[PDB]
Tab-separated table of N, CA and C in Angstrom:
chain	number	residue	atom	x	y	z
A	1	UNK	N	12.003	-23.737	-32.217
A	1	UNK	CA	10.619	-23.370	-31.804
A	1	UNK	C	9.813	-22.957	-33.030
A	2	UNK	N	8.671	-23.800	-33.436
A	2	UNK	CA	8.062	-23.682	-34.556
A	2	UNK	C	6.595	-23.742	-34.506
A	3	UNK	N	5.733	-22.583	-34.362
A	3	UNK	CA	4.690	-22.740	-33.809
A	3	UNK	C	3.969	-23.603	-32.615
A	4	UNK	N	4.924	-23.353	-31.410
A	4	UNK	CA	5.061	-23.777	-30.569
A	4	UNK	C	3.497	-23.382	-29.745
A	5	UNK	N	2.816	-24.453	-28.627
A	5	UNK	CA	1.908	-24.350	-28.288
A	5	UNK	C	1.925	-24.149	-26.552
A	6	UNK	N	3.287	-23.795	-26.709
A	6	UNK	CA	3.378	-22.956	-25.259
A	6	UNK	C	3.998	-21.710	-24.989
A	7	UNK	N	3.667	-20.906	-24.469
A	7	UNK	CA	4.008	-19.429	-24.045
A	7	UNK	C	5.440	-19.043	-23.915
A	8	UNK	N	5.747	-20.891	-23.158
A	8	UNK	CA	7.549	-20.928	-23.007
A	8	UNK	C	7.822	-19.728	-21.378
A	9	UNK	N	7.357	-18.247	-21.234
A	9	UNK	CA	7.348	-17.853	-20.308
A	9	UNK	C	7.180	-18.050	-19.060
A	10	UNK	N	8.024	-19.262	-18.597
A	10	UNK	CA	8.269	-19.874	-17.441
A	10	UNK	C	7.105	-20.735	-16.661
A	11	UNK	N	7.054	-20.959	-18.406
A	11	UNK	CA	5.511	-22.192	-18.184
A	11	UNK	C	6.031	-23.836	-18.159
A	12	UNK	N	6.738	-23.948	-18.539
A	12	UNK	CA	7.706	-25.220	-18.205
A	12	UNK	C	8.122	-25.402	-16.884
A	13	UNK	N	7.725	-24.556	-16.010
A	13	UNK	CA	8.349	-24.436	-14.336
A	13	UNK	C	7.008	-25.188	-13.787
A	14	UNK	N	6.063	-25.547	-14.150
A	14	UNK	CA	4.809	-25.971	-13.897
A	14	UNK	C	4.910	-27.794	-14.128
A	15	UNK	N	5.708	-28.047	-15.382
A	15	UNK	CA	5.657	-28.965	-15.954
A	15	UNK	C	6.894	-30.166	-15.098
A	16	UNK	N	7.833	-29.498	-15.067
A	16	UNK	CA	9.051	-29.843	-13.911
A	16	UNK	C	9.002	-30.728	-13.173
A	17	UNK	N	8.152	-29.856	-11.870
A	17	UNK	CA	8.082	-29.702	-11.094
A	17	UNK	C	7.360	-31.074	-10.180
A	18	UNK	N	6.258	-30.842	-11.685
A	18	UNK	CA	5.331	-31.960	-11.694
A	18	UNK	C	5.711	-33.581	-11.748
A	19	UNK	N	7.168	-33.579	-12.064
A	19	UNK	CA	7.827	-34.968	-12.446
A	19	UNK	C	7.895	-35.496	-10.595
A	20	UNK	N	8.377	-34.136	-9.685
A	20	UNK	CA	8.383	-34.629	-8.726
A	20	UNK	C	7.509	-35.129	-7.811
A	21	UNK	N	6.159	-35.011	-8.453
A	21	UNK	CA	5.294	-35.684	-7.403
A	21	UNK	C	4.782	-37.049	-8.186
A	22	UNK	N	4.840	-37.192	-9.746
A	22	UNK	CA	4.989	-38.102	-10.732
A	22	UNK	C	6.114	-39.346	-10.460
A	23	UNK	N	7.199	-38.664	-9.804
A	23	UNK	CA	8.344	-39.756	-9.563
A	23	UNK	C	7.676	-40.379	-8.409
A	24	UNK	N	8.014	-40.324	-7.181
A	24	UNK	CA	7.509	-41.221	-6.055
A	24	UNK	C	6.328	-42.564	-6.395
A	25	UNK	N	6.901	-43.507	-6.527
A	25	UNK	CA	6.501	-44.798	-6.302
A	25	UNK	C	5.026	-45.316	-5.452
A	26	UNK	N	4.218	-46.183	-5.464
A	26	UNK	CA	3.031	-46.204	-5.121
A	26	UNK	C	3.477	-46.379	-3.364
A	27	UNK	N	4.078	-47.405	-3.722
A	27	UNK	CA	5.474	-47.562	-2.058
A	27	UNK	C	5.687	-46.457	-1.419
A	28	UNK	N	5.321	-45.473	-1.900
A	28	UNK	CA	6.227	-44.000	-1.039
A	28	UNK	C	4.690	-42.940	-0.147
A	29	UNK	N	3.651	-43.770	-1.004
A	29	UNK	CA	2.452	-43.175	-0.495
A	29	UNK	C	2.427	-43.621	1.006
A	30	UNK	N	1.712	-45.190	0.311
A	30	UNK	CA	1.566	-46.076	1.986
A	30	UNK	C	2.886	-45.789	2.624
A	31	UNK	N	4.160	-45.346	2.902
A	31	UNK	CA	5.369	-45.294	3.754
A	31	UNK	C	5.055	-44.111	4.443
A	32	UNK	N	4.861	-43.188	3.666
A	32	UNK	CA	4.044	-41.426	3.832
A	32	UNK	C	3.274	-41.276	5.058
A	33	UNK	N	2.330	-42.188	4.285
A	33	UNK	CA	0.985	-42.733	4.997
A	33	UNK	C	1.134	-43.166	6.541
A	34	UNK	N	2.041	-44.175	6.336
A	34	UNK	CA	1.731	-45.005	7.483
A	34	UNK	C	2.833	-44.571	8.595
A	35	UNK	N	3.021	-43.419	8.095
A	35	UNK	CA	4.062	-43.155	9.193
A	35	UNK	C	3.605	-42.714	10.772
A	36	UNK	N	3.446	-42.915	11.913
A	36	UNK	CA	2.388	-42.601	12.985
A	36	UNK	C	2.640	-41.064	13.107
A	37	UNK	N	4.027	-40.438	13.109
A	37	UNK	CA	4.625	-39.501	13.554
A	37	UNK	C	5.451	-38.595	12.446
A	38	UNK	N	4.906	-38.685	11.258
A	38	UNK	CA	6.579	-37.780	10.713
A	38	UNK	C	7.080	-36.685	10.841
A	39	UNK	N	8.026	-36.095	10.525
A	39	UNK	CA	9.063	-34.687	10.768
A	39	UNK	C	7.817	-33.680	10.591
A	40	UNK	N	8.102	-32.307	10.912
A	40	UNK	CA	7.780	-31.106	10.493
A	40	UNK	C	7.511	-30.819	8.825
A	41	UNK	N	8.689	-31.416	8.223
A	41	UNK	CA	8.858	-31.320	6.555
A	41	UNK	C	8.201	-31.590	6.343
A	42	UNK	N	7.470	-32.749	6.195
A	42	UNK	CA	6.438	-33.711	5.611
A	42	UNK	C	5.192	-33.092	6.211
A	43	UNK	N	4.570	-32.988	7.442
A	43	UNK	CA	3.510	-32.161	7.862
A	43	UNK	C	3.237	-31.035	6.913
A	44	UNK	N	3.926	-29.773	7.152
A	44	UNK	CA	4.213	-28.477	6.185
A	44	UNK	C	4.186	-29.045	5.094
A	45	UNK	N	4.084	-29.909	4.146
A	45	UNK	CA	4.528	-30.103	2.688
A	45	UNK	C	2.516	-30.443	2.279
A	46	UNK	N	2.242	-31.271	3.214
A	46	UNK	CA	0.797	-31.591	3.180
A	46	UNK	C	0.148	-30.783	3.227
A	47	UNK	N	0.391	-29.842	4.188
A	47	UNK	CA	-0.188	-28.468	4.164
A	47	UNK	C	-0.682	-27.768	3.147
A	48	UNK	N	0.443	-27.663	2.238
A	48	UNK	CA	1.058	-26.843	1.152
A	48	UNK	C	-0.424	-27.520	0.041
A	49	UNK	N	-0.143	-28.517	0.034
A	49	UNK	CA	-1.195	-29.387	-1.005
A	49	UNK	C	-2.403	-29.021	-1.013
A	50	UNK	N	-2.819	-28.956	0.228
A	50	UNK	CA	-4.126	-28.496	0.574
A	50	UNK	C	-4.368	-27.056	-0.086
A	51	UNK	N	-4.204	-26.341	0.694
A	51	UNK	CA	-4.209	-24.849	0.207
A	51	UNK	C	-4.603	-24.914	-1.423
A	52	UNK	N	-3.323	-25.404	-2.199
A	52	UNK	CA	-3.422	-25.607	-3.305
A	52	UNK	C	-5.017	-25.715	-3.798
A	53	UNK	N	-5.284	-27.321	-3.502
A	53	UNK	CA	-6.634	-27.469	-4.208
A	53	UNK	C	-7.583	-26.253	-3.477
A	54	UNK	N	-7.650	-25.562	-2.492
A	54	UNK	CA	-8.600	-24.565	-2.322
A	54	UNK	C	-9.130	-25.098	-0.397
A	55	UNK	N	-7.889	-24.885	0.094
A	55	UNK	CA	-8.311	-25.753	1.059
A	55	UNK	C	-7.248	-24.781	2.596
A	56	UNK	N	-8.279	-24.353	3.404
A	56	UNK	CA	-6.781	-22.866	4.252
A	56	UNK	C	-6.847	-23.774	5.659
A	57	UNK	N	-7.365	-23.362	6.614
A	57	UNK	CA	-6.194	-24.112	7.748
A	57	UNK	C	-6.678	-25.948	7.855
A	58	UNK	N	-6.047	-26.147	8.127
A	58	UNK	CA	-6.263	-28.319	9.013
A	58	UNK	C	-5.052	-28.568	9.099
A	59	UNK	N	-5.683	-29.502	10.348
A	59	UNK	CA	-5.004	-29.842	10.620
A	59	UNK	C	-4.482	-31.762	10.236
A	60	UNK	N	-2.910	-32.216	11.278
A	60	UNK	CA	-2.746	-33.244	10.448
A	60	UNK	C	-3.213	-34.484	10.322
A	61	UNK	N	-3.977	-34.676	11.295
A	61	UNK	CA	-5.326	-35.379	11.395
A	61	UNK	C	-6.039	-35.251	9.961
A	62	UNK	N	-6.713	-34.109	9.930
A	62	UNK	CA	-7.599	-33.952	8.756
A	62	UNK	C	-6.892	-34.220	7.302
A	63	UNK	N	-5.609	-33.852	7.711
A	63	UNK	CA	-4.842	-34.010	6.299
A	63	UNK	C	-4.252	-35.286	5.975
A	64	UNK	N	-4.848	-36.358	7.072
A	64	UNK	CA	-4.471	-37.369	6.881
A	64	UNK	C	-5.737	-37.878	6.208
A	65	UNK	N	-6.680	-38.086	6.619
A	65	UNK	CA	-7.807	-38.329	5.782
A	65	UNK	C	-7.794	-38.231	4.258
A	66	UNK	N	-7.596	-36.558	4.361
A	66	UNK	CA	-7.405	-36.451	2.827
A	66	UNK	C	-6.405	-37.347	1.773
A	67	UNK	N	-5.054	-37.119	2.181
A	67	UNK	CA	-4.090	-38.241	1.576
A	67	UNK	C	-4.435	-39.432	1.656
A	68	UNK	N	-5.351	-39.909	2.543
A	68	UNK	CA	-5.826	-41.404	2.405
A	68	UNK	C	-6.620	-41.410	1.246
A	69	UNK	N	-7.082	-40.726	0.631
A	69	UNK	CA	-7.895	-40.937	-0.827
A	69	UNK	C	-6.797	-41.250	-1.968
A	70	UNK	N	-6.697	-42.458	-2.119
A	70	UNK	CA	-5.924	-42.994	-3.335
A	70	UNK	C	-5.553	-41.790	-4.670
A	71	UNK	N	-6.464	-40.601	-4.270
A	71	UNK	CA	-6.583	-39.304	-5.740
A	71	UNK	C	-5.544	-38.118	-4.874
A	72	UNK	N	-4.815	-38.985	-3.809
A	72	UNK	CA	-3.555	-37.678	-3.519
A	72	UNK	C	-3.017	-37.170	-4.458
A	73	UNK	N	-2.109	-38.184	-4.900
A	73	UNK	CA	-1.081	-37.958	-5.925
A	73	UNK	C	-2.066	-37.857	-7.237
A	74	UNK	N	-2.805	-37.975	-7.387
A	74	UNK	CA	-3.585	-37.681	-8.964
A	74	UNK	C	-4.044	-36.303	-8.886
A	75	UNK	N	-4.838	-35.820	-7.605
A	75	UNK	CA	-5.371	-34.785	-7.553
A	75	UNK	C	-4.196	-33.498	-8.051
A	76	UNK	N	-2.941	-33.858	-7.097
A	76	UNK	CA	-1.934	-33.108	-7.268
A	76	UNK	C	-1.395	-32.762	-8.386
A	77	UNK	N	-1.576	-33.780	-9.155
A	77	UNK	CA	-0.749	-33.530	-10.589
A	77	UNK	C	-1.861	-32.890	-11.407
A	78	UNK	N	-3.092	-33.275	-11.304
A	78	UNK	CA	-4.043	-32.965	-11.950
A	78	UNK	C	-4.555	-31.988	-11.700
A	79	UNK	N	-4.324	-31.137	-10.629
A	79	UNK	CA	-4.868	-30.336	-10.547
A	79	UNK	C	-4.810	-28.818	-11.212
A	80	UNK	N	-5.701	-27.889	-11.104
A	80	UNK	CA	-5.793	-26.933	-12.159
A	80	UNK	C	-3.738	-26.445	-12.628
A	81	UNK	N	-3.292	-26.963	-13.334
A	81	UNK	CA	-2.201	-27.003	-13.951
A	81	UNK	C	-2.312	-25.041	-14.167
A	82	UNK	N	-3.076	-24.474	-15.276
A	82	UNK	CA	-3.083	-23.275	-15.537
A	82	UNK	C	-4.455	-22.305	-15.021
A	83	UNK	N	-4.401	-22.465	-13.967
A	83	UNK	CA	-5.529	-22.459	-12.444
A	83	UNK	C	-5.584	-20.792	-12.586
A	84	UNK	N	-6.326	-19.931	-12.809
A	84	UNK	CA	-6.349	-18.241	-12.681
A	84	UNK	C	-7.388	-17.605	-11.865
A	85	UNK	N	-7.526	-16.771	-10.583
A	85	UNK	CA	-8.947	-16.357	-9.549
A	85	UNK	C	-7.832	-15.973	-9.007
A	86	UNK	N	-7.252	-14.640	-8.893
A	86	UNK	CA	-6.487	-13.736	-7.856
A	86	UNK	C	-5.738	-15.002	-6.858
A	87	UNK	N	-4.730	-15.256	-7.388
A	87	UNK	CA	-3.479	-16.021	-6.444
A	87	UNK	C	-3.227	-15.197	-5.335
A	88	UNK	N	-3.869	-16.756	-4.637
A	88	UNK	CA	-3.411	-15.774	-3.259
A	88	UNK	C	-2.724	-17.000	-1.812
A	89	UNK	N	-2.032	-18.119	-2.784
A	89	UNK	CA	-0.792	-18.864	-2.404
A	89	UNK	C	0.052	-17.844	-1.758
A	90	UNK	N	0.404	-16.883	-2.894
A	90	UNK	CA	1.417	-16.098	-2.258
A	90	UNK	C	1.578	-15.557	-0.688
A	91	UNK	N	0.414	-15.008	-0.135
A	91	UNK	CA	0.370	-14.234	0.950
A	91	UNK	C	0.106	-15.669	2.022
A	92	UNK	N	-0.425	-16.675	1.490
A	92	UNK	CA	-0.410	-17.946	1.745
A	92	UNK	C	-0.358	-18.486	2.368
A	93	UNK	N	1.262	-19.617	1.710
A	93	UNK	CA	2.545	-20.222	1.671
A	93	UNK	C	3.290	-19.117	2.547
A	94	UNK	N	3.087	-18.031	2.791
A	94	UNK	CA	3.997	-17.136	3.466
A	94	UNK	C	3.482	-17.051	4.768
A	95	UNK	N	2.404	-16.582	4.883
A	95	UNK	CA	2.044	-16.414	6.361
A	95	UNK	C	2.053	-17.924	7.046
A	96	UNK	N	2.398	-18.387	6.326
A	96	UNK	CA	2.377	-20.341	7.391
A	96	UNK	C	3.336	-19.939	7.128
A	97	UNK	N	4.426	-20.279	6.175
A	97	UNK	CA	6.224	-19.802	6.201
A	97	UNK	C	6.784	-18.816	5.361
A	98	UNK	N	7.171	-17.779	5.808
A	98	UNK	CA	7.270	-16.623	5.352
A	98	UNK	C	8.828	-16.326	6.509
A	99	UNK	N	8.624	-16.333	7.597
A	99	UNK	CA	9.865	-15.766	8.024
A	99	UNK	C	10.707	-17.467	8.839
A	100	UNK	N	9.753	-18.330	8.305
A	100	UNK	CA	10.643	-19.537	8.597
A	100	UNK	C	11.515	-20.289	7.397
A	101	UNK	N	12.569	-20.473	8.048
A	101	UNK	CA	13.375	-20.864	6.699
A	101	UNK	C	13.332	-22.317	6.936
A	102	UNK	N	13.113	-22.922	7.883
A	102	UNK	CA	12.951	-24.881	8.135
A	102	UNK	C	12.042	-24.993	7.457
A	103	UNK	N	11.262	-24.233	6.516
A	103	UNK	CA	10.549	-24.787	4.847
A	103	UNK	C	11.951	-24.674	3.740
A	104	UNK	N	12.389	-25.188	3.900
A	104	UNK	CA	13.838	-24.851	2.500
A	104	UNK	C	13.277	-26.742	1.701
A	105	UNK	N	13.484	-26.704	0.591
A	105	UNK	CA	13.735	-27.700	-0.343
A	105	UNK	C	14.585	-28.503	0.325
A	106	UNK	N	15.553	-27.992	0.628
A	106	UNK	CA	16.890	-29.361	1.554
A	106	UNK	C	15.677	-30.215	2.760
A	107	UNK	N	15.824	-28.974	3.533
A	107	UNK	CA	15.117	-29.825	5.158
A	107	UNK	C	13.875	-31.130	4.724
A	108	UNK	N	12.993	-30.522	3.943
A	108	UNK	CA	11.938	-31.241	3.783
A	108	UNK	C	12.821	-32.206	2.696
A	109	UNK	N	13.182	-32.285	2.040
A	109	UNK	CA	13.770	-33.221	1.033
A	109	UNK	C	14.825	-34.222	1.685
A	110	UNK	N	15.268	-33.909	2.801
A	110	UNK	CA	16.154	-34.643	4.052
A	110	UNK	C	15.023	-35.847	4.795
A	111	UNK	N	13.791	-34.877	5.276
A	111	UNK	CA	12.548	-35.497	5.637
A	111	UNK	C	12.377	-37.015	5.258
A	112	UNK	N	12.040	-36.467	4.158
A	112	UNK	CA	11.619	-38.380	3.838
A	112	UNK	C	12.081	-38.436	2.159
A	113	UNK	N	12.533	-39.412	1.804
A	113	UNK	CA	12.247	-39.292	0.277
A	113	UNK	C	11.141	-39.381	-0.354
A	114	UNK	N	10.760	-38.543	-0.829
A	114	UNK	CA	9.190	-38.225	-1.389
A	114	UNK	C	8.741	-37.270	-1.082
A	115	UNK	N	9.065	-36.623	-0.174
A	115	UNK	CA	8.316	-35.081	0.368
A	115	UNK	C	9.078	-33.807	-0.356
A	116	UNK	N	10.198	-34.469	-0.959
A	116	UNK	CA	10.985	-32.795	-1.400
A	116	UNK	C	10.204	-33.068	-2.466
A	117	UNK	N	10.940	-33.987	-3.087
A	117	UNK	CA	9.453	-33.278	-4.900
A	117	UNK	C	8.283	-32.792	-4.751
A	118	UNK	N	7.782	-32.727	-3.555
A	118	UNK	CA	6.374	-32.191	-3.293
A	118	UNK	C	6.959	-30.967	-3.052
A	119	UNK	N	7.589	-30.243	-2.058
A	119	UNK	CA	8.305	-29.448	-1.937
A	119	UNK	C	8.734	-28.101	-2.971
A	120	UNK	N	8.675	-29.074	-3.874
A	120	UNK	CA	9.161	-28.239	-5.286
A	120	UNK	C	7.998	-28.531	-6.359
A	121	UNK	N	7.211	-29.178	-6.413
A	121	UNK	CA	5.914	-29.414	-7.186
A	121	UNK	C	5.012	-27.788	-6.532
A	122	UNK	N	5.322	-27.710	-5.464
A	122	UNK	CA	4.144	-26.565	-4.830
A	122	UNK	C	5.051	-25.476	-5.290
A	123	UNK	N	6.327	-25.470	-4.689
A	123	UNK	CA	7.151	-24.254	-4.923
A	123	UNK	C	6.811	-23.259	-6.207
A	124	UNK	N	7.175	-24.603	-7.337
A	124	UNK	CA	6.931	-23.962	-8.989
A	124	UNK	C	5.661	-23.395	-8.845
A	125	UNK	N	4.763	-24.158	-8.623
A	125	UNK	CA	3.778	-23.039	-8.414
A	125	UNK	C	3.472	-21.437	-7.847
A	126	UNK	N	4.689	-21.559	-6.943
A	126	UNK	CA	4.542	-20.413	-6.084
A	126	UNK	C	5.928	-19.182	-7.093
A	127	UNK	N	7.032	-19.722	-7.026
A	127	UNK	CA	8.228	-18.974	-7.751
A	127	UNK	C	8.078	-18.552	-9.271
A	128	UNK	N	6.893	-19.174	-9.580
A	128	UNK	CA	6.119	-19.094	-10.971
A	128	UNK	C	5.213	-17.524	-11.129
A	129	UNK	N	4.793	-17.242	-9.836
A	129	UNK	CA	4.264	-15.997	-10.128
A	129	UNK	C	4.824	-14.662	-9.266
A	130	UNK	N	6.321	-15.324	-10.074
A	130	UNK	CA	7.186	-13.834	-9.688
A	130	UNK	C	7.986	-13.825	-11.278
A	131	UNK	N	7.827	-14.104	-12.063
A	131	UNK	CA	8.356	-14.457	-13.397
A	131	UNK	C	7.595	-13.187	-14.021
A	132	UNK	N	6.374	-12.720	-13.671
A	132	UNK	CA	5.633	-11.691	-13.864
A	132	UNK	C	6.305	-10.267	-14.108
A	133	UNK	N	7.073	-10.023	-12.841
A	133	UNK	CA	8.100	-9.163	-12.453
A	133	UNK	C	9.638	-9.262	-12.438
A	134	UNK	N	9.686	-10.444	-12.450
A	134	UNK	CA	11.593	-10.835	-12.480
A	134	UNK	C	12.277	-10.187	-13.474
A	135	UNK	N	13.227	-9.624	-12.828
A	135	UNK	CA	14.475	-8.689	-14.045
A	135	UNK	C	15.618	-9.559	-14.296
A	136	UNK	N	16.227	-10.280	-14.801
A	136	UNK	CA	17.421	-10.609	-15.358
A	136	UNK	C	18.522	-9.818	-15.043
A	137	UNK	N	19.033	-10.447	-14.014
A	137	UNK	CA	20.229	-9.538	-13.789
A	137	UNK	C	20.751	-8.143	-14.966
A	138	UNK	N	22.015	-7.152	-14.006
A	138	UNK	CA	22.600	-6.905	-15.256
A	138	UNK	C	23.398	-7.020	-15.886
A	139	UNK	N	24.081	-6.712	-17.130
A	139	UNK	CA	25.166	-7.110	-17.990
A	139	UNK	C	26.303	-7.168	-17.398
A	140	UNK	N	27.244	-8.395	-17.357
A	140	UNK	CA	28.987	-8.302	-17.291
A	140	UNK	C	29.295	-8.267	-17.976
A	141	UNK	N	30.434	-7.431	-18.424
A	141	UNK	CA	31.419	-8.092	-19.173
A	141	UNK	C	32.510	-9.019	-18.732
């Protein structure tokens, strides 16, 4: 590390994360897309997106619209990467799932292929601002 132009402080959890909505294939949109009916996972994961760009309840109707704009997957990746105005994902992402655990990385990543990297594209965002406070275990010998 030699005058490095990142903080490194669990700012790479941003960068990750991002491969997973980067990986999925143009194929995985329209499949997404055109699905009439999909799981819970995939619903909740769309959800998640929304919020993100600045966006609180709709439904999946409406959130279908939105993903129909060819700038899904661009918006997502592109979007404010190092984004700062009182985070408030946290209280969020929680009050939609907070005491439900059928949001886990597995279930939705079982869902469809393509919805867990989303899954974890939002997550980093979210497990990212507990790095603030996180203690490192303590010492074994």
């Amino acid at each position: 590390g030699s005058h490095m132009k990142s903080i490194q402080d669990c700012e790479p959890t941003i960068l990750e994360a991002q491969r997973g909505v980067k990986n999925i294939k143009k194929q995985q949109l329209t499949e997404i897309r055109s699905m009439v009916n999909p799981p819970s996972g995939v619903k909740i994961v769309m959800e998640a997106v929304c919020a993100i760009l600045g966006y609180q309840f709709s439904n999946w109707r409406d959130i279908q619209q939105f993903i129909r704009k060819d700038d899904f997957i661009h918006n997502i990746v592109h979007y404010d990467t190092t984004l700062h105005m009182k985070p408030q994902i946290r209280k969020y992402m929680e009050e939609e799932f907070l005491s439900d655990p059928n949001f886990t990385y597995e279930t939705i990543n079982r869902a469809s292929k393509a919805c867990g990297p989303l899954y974890q594209w939002v997550n980093a965002q979210i497990n990212f601002s507990k790095c603030l406070e996180n203690v490192d275990p303590l010492r074994q010998e």
